[PDB]
Amino acid sequence: PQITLWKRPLVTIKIGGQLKEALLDTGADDTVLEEMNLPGRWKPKMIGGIGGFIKVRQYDQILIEICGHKAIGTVLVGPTPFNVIGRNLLTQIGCTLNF
């Protein structure tokens, strides 16, 4: 679909069999989700945002479904203000910016 930006580009995602709301975020390299239980092993990592750096749990090769489109990649879990879908997954679903 084509998504205009008059309001936040919020979409429903499916991860770990649960539905959630997330923000399509072209300014994010990586995908960062709010605290949640995800299966599989994870490694401690750090990620930096506008306000500094936070501790996150890095899950690799996670299946996420974004508006029906499937992606399999890295998901960082930690104290983010919002579920953000970053470019690592936006590329998988074939997302581009157009003006």
Ligand X SMILES: CC(C)CN(C[C@@H](O)[C@H](Cc1ccccc1)NC(=O)O[C@H]1CO[C@H]2OCC[C@H]21)S(=O)(=O)c1ccc(N)cc1
Active site residue 25: yes
Q: In the window 26-85, what residues touch its own copies (CB under 8 A)?
A: 26-29, 32, 47-54, 67, 69, 80-82, 84
Q: Report the run of H or E that residue 88 belongs to, with start and end.
A: helix 87-90
Which residue, 19 or 97, has its beta carbon nearer to its own copies?
Answer: 97
**How many binding residues for ligand X (CB under 6 A)?**
15
Given 25, 29, 30, 60, the catalytic residue = 25
Question: Please, which residues have CB within 8 angstroms of residue 31's CB and are 6 or more apart in sequence?
Answer: 64, 73, 74, 75, 76, 84, 85, 86, 88, 89
When asked if residue 66 is in the footprint of ligand X (CB under 6 A), the reply is no
In the complex with ligand X, the residue whose CB is nearer, 17 or 82, is 82
Q: What are phi and psi of 88, to 5 degrees?
A: -60, -30
Q: Name the token pair of 12.
A: 């429903």
Nearest to 31 by CA among 2, 68, 92, 73: 73
The least distance separating ligand X from the CB of residue 65, rounded to whole angstroms, comes to 20
Query: Given the rule CB under 6 A, which residues bind ligand X?
Result: 23, 25, 27-30, 32, 47-50, 81-82, 84, 86
